[PDB]
Amino acid sequence: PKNVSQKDAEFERTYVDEVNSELVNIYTFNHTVTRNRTEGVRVSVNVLNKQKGAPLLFVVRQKEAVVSFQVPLILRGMFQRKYLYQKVERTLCQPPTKNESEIQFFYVDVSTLSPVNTTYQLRVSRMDDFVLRTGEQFSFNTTAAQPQYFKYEFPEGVDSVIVKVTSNKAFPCSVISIQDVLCPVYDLDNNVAFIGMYQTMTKKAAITVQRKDFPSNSFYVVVVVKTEDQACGGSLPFYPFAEDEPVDQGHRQKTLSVLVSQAVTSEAYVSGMLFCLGIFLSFYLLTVLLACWENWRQTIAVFYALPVVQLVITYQTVVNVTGNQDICYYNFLCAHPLGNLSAFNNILSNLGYILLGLLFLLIILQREINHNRALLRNDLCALECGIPKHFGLFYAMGTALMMEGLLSACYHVCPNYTNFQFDTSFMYMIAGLCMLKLYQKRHPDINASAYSAYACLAIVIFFSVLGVVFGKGNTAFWIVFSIIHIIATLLLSTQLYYMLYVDRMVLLVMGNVINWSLAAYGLIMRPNDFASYLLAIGICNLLLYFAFYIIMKLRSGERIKLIPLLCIVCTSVVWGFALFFFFQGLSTWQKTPAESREHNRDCILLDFFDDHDIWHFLSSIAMFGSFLVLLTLDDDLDTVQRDKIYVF
Amino acid sequence: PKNVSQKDAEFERTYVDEVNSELVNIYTFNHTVTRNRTEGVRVSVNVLNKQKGAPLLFVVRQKEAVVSFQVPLILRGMFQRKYLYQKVERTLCQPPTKNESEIQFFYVDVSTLSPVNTTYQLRVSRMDDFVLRTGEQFSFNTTAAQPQYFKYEFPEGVDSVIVKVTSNKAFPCSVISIQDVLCPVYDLDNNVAFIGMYQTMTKKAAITVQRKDFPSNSFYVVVVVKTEDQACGGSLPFYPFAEDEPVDQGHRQKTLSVLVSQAVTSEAYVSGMLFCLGIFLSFYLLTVLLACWENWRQTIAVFYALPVVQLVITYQTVVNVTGNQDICYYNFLCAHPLGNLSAFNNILSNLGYILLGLLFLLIILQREINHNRALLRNDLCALECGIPKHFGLFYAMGTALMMEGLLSACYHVCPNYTNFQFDTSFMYMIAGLCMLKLYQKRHPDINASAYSAYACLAIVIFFSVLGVVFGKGNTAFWIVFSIIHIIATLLLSTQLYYMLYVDRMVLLVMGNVINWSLAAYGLIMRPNDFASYLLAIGICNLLLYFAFYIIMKLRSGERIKLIPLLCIVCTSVVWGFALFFFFQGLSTWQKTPAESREHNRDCILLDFFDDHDIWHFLSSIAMFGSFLVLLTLDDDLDTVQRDKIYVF
Ligand SMILES: *[C@@H]1O[C@H](CO)[C@@H](O[C@@H]2O[C@H](CO)[C@@H](O)[C@H](O)[C@H]2NC(C)=O)[C@H](O)[C@H]1NC(C)=O
Ligand SMILES: *[C@@H]1O[C@H](CO)[C@@H](O[C@@H]2O[C@H](CO)[C@@H](O)[C@H](O)[C@H]2NC(C)=O)[C@H](O)[C@H]1NC(C)=O
Ligand SMILES: *[C@@H]1O[C@H](CO)[C@@H](O[C@@H]2O[C@H](CO)[C@@H](O)[C@H](O)[C@H]2NC(C)=O)[C@H](O)[C@H]1NC(C)=O
Ligand SMILES: *[C@@H]1O[C@H](CO)[C@@H](O[C@@H]2O[C@H](CO)[C@@H](O)[C@H](O)[C@H]2NC(C)=O)[C@H](O)[C@H]1NC(C)=O
Ligand SMILES: *[C@@H]1O[C@H](CO)[C@@H](O)[C@H](O)[C@H]1NC(C)=O
Ligand SMILES: *[C@@H]1O[C@H](CO)[C@@H](O)[C@H](O)[C@H]1NC(C)=O
Ligand SMILES: *[C@@H]1O[C@H](CO)[C@@H](O)[C@H](O)[C@H]1NC(C)=O
Ligand SMILES: *[C@@H]1O[C@H](CO)[C@@H](O)[C@H](O)[C@H]1NC(C)=O
Ligand SMILES: [Zn+2]
Ligand SMILES: [Zn+2]
C-alpha cells in the first residue's frame, strides 16, 4: 500500500527528506545515557515550503513516552486568532534510569496526508547544557513553538535556591515554570500552568524553591513563550491576518538567562531578627535611661482589619496551593519564606510601628499619671498654667501607629492590587491626626465642637480608592486630580487669610508654591498611585505645618528647649531618609504582575531587608519623633503662667 | 529492520493484535463526513496484560491533527502519586469541512519498545450521540483515562443556553468545560482549564453560555474526571500503593447527564424588573394614601463598603476573563447575566432594602417636621406628654437598612467565601439597633450615657469572622459557641433579675428556654455558618423582646392601637416567611464550590427570582414593618399626659 522508509540516523545531522501521502519516514536514533550525567536531547524540525492543505505530522516515540506535534504548528490567540510557526523544537522527556549505563533507542515518525511532496529538515541535537549549576548563567533562545526546559540538581548542603531569569527585551510574554523531575514535562502553552510554581515574565522572574518540595532533589525550569503580550500587559494585536488565514509568527524570539543561586541561610533570619528588635529596643532602653535621669534628678481599625485578614488567608493559601505567583506583588528577589508566609522580611520590618507605638503609649501614660498626680497636689502651674494638657489624642496617635503596623504587616503577607489601600491609608490618618493636633493644642476651645476626624478620614478614603479602581488616568484623571490639588491649595490659602501677620502670609505663600511643585509631579500624571502621593503630599504638608508652628513659637519669643530641638532634627533627618526610600518604591499593585516584576530589586541591608522594609523602620522612627515633638514642643510654655496674650 | 503491518481496518470491530519491539501495526480507517451531521469518532484501546517495563504507545494521525497517548496511561496525583489506567478512550478531533461530502482517512499507529509480546484491543466506534439537542438528556460513562466531549449547535432564534450536568454519586471529581469549536479540543487533565468556562462538579454543574461568545454558533461540552477528590473536597488518599509502583485505578467511573436548555428570555428580565418595583412602589403609594387620609381628615458603612467594592471589581473581572466559575458561589441554576454581572437577579432583589429604607427615612422626616411644628405651636402634649420622641435612632435604622441593601447587592454580584460577612453583618447591627431602641424609648435617661453601639458591633463582628476563618468546628468549636450562647442566656437572665414581676420572670424564663432550643441547633454543631445563625438568633431574640414589650404594654393598661396591631401581624407573618426562606438557604460560602453546587436550586418566582431573593424582598418588608411598629407602638401614650408612674 504505502512505502515506509525505516532508516538508521546518526544524531547530529540535518536530514532533508521528502514525504507525501504515500511515504512515511522512520528514523532510528541510538544514544547512551548515564545516571551521573542526565544530558537530555532536543528534536528540531523545520518545514521549508508551507503546505496549506495538510500540515506535516511528527511523532517522537521513546521507551516510556510519545511526543507528537504538527509542523507548521498553529497556536491559539486571544480572539479566534491562529499563529503559524514553521519551526518546532522540543526537548525529549527522559525517565530515570534503573541500571547504571543504558543504550536507549527512540524513533522519530514523519508523515503527512498532503498529496504533494513536502520537504523538511530534522536534526536531533544532544544538549550538554541541560544541567544547571549554581551561580552559572545560561543564555538561550526560545520561541512559542520552541519551548526549553532545564534540570537543576540540588548540591549537598543546600536547602533552598532561587531561580532568576532575566531578559534584555520585555516582549514577547513568557511563562517560567518550576516542575518536579517526573516525566512528562509540561512545556506547552496549554499545560504549562497545570503543576508547579509558574509566573509570567517580561524582564525579570524570580522563583524560590526548596528541597522539601521535591523528594528527587531536582526540578525542571520550564520556559514557555506566550504568543500574545496582553497578559504581560503590553499591547493587544487588533489587525494581523484577517479571518481564517493563520498569521505567520516565529520572528518573535525571547532571549533569557537563568541564574540559580543559593538562597539566604538561617543566619540572615537570626540577624534580621536581632536587627529588628535591637534597633527599636534601643529606643526602649533610651527612654528608660531618660526616665531614670529625671527621677534621680528630681473601632475604625477593627472594621478596616477584618476584611484584611479574610483576604490574607484566602490569597496566601491560593498562592501556596495553586503555584500561581502572579497573584501577590511580592519582591520576589528579596522575599524570604518562613512557614506559610512567602515574604517574612516585610512582616518582620513592620514590627517597628508596633513597638514604637507601644513605647509612645507608655510615655503618654506616664505623662498622664504625672499630670494627674500634680493636679492632686493642687499645683497652680498644673491647674491653670501652660498649654492645656490633652493626652487622649496622643493615645489616638499611638494606637494609630500600632494599628498601622498591624495592618501593613497583614497587607505585606501578600501585597496585591486588591490590598493597596490597606498599607497607605492609616498613615494618612496618622498624618491627618498630627494635622490639627497642634491646632487643638493651641486652640482647645475650637476642638470642643470640631467634628473633623470622620470628615477627614472619609475624604481621604474616598479619594484614594475609586480613582484607582476606575482607571489609571484617562489622559488624565490625574491631571484632574492635580486641579483638585490646586483648589485644595486655594482652600489652604483661604484658611491662611482667616488666620494676621505678613510673615505668616509669605510662609503660606511658599507653602502653596511647594504644593504646586508637588502638583507638577501630580502632572506627567502620577505614574504611580495616588495612594503613595496622598501619603507623600500629606507628609510634606505635615512637615510644612510643623515648620509653620515652630517659626510661630520662635517669633512669639517662646524658646524651644533642647529636647524638642533634638527631636526636631532627628525627625527631619529620619523623615528625609524615609521619604527617599518611599520615593524609590514604585509600581507594585497598579501595574500588571509581569510588568511589576521588572522593578524588583535585591536585598540591601543584612541580606534580608529591602528598601520598603527600610521605609517601615524609618517611618516609625520618624513618626515617633513627630509625636515626641508634639509632646514636648510647648514645654517652655508649661513651666510658666498661661499666656495673657491671645493664642496665635 | 523492523516489520510494519499496514492493514486496512473496518470501523466497528475489536482488533486483538500482538506488538513487540520488532513489530509496528498500522491501521487505516476510511469514513465519510458531512457538514450537516458532524458525527465525531471515538478510539478505544485496552491493554489486556500489563507491561511493567515499557508502555504501549498509540498514535492517531488525522489530516490536521495528531493525538498520541500511552497505554497503560499513568496520571499524576497530588503528592507524587501515579495512577495506572489500562483502558484509554479519546474522541478524535474533527476540523470543519470546506466541501459538502468528504471521504477522510485517519491512521492509528500502535508500537512499543518492550521486547516481550503484548496484546491489545483497538475499536474505533462512530458516535451518533455527538450532537446535543435542547431538552434532551444523555447519560454516559467517563473515566479519568476516558474523557468525553459533545457538540451543541445553537438553534435559530436562541441567544443563550444553560448546560446542566447531573450525577447520581458525588465522586469522583470532574471538570466540565465549555469550549469553542476550533480544533483541537482540550480534554486532558492538564489542559482542560486552558480556555473556556470550566467548573468542578460532584453532583451538579450548570454553565450559562451565549451566542455572542462563539462566532461559530456551537461549542464543545468537555467533561474530564479528576483522579483525586481533594479539590472537590471529599477526602485525601493517604495509603494506595507505596513509593514508585503506580496505583491501579479505572474502577472509578462517573455517570453524568448533560441537559442543554434554552435560557430565560428578555421577558423574564422585564417581568422581574416590574415585580421588583411594583411591590415596593406599592408601599410608596400606600403610605401616600395613608398620609393623604390624615391630611384631609385633619461612617462605619463607608469603611465597610470600600474593600467590598474593590473585591467586587477584582473577583468579577477575574471570573469573567479566566472562566474559572469555581471562584464565585453563585446560584448557577438561577443566576441570570446582565452585562458584566453574572447574577442580576440577586442584585435586583436587593432593591427592596434600598427603596423601603428610603421610604422609612421619608416617613421619619415627615414625623420629625410635624413634631417640630407642634413644638413651635407650644402644645403642652408635644412638649411634656407621651414617650419622648427621638427620631435620630430611627434615622440610623433607616440608613442601616439602605446600606444593608447596598452592601448585600455588592456581595451578591459575586457571593464568595471571601465575602460572607458582608451580607449578614449589617442585618445583625440593624437588629442590634432595634434591640434597645425600645429600651431607649422607655428609658431615654439611660441612653444619655449608653455607649453600647460600638461595643455591640465589635462583639458581633469579632464573633462572626475568626471562628469561621480558623475552622468549621473542631468537634466542636461550635459546641464551644453553644456554651457561649448558654452563658449569654445566663447574662440575659441576669439582666432580667435586674429589671420586678412574676410574669416578666416567667416570660424571660421561656425566652431562655427558646434560646437553649436554638442552642441545640448550635449543636449537631453549625453545619451552617454562625453568620446565618447570629442573624437568626438575633432576629429570634428581637422578636422575643418585641413580644415582651407588647405584653408589658397590655399589662400596664396601655392599649395598642389599630395601626400598631396591623403592623405587628404583618411583621410577624412576613418575618415567619422570611425566616423560612432564610432557613432554606444553606451551605454556600463555607463548603467547597463543587460541594456548594450540589445544593443549588432552580428559580421559583417568575422564572427569575430564587429563594434567597425572596428572602431579600421579605426581610426588607419585615424590617420596615418592625421599624413601623417601633414608630407607632406608643402612640396611645403620646395622646395623653406623660405617665406619673415610673417607667417599666
Ligand atoms: C547505532 O545505530 C547504527 C546501526 O545500528 C550504528 O551507528 C553508526 O551507523 C552507521 C552505519 O549504518 C555508521 O556511521 C557506523 O558504522 C555506526 N557506528 C558508529 C559508532 O557511528 C551503531 O552500530 C549503533 N550503535 C549502537 C550502540 O548500537
Ligand atoms: C539568539 O538569536 C540571536 C538573533 O539571531 C542570535 O544572534 C545572532 O547569532 C548569529 C549566529 O549565527 C550571528 O551571526 C548574529 O550576528 C547574531 N546577531 C546579533 C547578535 O544581533 C544569537 O546567537 C542566538 N543565541 C543562541 C544561543 O543561539
Ligand atoms: C475503505 O477501505 C477498504 C479498502 O480501501 C474498503 O472497505 C472494505 O474493505 C474490505 C476489503 O478489504 C471489505 O469489507 C469491503 O470489500 C470494503 N468495502 C466495504 C464497503 O466494506 C473500501 O473500499 C474503502 N472505502 C472507500 C470509500 O474508499
Ligand atoms: C455505565 O457503567 C455502568 C456500570 O457498569 C453500566 O451499568 C451496567 O451495564 C451493563 C451493560 O452491559 C449491565 O449488564 C449491568 O447490569 C449494568 N449495571 C448496573 C446498571 O448496575 C452502564 O450501562 C454504563 N452506561 C453506559 C452508557 O455504557
Ligand atoms: C518504497 O519505499 C522506499 C522508501 O524510499 C523506497 O524503496 C521507494 O521509494 C519505494 N518503492 C516503490 C514505491 O516502488
Ligand atoms: C541492566 O539491564 C539488563 C537488561 O535486562 C540486565 O540484564 C542487567 O542485569 C542490568 N544490570 C544490572 C547491573 O542489574
Ligand atoms: C513482517 O511483518 C509482517 C507483519 O505481520 C509479516 O509479514 C511478518 O510477521 C513479518 N515477516 C518476517 C518477520 O519475516
Ligand atoms: C471537493 O474537493 C475536491 C478535491 O480537490 C475538488 O476537486 C472539488 O472541486 C471539491 N468540490 C467542490 C464542490 O468544490
Ligand atoms: Zn508597606
Ligand atoms: Zn443574600
Side-chain angles (χ1 to χ4, degrees), chain B residues 18-87:
Chain B
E18 99 166 332
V19 280
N20 40 307
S21 303
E22 311 319 294
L23 211 71
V24 163
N25 279 340
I26 276 292
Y27 299 96
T28 297
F29 293 98
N30 46 4
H31 68 100
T32 305
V33 85
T34 55
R35 174 181 290 71
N36 38 286
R37 179 67 65 180
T38 166
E39 255 189 10
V41 312
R42 189 161 186 84
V43 177
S44 181
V45 284
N46 190 326
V47 170
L48 300 177
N49 69 38
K50 177 166 49 183
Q51 191 31 237
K52 185 182 297 297
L56 213 75
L57 313 159
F58 293 82
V59 200
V60 193
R61 318 199 322 256
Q62 314 143 40
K63 193 174 182 56
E64 289 189 2
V66 168
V67 180
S68 56
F69 39 90
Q70 50 150 349
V71 197
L73 185 64
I74 284 147
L75 287 113
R76 274 275 305 172
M78 205 60 101
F79 275 121
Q80 316 259 339
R81 253 182 294 251
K82 296 301 185 168
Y83 301 106
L84 177 131
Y85 295 72
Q86 295 187 15
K87 192 180 182 306

Side-chain angles (χ1 to χ4, degrees), chain B residues 315-450 452-453 455-461 464-469 471 473 475-486 488-490 492-496 499-509 511-515 517-523 527-532:
Chain B
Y315 284 134
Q316 183 59 218
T317 50
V318 159
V319 162
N320 292 342
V321 300
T322 36
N324 193 18
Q325 293 177 335
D326 295 329
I327 310 172
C328 300
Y329 290 72
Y330 294 140
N331 184 12
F332 294 105
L333 289 172
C334 202
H336 299 300
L338 191 60
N340 233 9
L341 308 169
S342 211
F344 185 56
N345 48 334
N346 309 138
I347 311 161
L348 177 51
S349 73
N350 283 260
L351 202 66
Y353 298 91
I354 277 289
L355 292 187
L356 283 192
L358 185 67
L359 183 57
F360 174 72
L361 283 189
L362 297 184
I363 293 178
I364 296 299
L365 187 59
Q366 197 282 338
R367 265 183 168 259
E368 153 145 339
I369 286 181
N370 204 19
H371 169 72
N372 258 37
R373 283 180 181 180
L375 293 183
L376 255 293
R377 309 307 180 271
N378 300 325
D379 180 32
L380 194 59
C381 302
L383 290 159
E384 304 174 3
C385 303
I387 288 274
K389 285 200 171 188
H390 294 166
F391 302 106
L393 195 42
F394 285 124
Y395 284 130
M397 310 155 98
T399 305
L401 198 65
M402 290 223 329
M403 193 85 188
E404 156 66 8
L406 180 63
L407 284 171
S408 188
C410 289
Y411 157 78
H412 271 291
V413 305
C414 167
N416 158 12
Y417 181 86
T418 189
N419 291 309
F420 52 72
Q421 77 199 330
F422 283 149
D423 186 287
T424 173
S425 288
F426 258 45
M427 281 281 301
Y428 34 82
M429 174 255 266
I430 313 170
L433 259 52
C434 302
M435 271 305 88
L436 305 177
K437 172 57 194 179
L438 292 161
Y439 185 80
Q440 176 266 283
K441 214 162 61 153
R442 276 293 162 106
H443 307 113
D445 295 354
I446 309 293
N447 199 225
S449 295
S452 179
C456 175
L457 312 201
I459 289 171
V460 288
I461 66 192
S464 60
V465 177
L466 271 195
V468 180
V469 165
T475 188
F477 166 75
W478 298 117
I479 292 180
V480 187
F481 167 74
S482 303
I483 306 174
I484 300 176
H485 190 209
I486 292 176
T489 314
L490 295 178
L492 293 170
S493 177
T494 297
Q495 296 159 18
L496 166 76
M499 301 195 198
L500 198 51
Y501 311 111
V502 191
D503 310 344
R504 178 178 303 176
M505 282 315 128
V506 304
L507 215 165
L508 269 300
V509 157
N512 295 339
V513 177
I514 290 171
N515 306 153
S517 303
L518 296 162
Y521 297 110
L523 295 52
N528 289 337
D529 211 7
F530 169 34
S532 300

Side-chain angles (χ1 to χ4, degrees), chain A residues 284-302 304-340:
Chain A
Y284 272 73
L285 65 99
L286 184 64
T287 190
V288 170
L289 187 65
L290 185 59
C292 87
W293 189 34
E294 300 160 357
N295 293 347
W296 169 18
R297 175 251 310 263
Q298 188 68 39
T299 58
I300 298 173
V302 172
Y304 216 73
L306 302 169
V308 176
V309 177
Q310 191 202 18
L311 278 41
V312 179
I313 298 310
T314 48
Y315 284 134
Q316 183 59 218
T317 50
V318 159
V319 162
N320 292 342
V321 300
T322 36
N324 193 18
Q325 293 177 335
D326 295 329
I327 310 172
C328 300
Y329 290 72
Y330 294 140
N331 184 12
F332 294 105
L333 289 172
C334 202
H336 299 300
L338 191 60
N340 233 9

